[PDB]
Amino acid sequence: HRKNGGKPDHVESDISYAVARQLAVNLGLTGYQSLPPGIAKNLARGKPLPPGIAKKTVPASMLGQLPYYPGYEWKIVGDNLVLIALSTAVVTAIINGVFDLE
Amino acid sequence: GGKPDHVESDISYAVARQLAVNLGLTGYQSLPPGIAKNLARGKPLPPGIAKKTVPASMLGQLPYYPGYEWKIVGDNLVLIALSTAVVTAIINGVFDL
């Protein structure tokens, strides 16, 4: 059936997670390790990715299916999908859990 | 244009638009201007307006929220509260030409 989203209080976030998770799973990009505890749930939109935290490359197959904004790039951060401004590493959108184990 | 001011809205439009294009669900007419101004988050759908059914093949790919359902309104994909006809989310221009 369809995924029961409960209350429609963040419908666009639900849609965004669902397609990112479909991409990750169907491309074999699951099982990524989460960020260290203390860092994990604490990325902040409008601030740079914390120092010493890896941002890994998202494959072209997946980047073809996510929106493209000149001057920004989608990255894997822990098990999350994160759009980051090039150069400043300013976190711009965060979709959590996309690359978690299945 | 081309800036990430509303990234989740852009993702949601792309998902909806692609489902529609992939099913050939296109060439619905937008609402004319004097009706369009009354389609708004939190307002009841104006009566008079056709609400069309989203085809199973597509609706099966959209989130489900108990007590609400997706309809086609003009060329928009719209989540509506069933008990009140209150417009709860709008994805604009999904079913355009």
Domains and CATH numbers, chain B: 1-97 (3.10.450.160)
Six-digit token string for B65? 């929220």
- Tell me how close the Cα of B29 comes to any Cα of chain A, in angstroms: 24
DSSP state of B76: E
Q: Which string of DSSP letters, residue by residue, matches B7-72?
A: HHHHHHHHHHHHHHHHTT---PPPPPHHHHTT--TTSBPPTTS--EEPPHHHHTTS-B-TTEEEEE
Q: Residue A82: what residue type?
A: V
- Residue reference for tokens 């639900």: A14
Return d(Cα B73, Cα B57) in angstroms, integer. 18
- Residue reference for tokens 């491309």: A27
Containing A60, the helix (H) or strand (E) segment is: helix A60-63
- Tell me how close the Cα of B71 comes to any Cα of chain A, in angstroms: 15
Return d(Cα A47, Cα A50) in angstroms, integer. 8
Six-digit token string for B94? 């999904």
Whether B7 contacts chain A with CB within 8 A:
yes
Whether B27 contacts chain A with CB within 8 A:
no
- Residue reference for tokens 């994909």: B77
CB A25 within 8 A of CB A100: no
Enter the resolution in angstroms.
Answer: 1.9
Pairwise CB contact (< 8 Å): B89 & A6? no
| Chain B residues touching A3 at Cβ < 8 A | 63-64
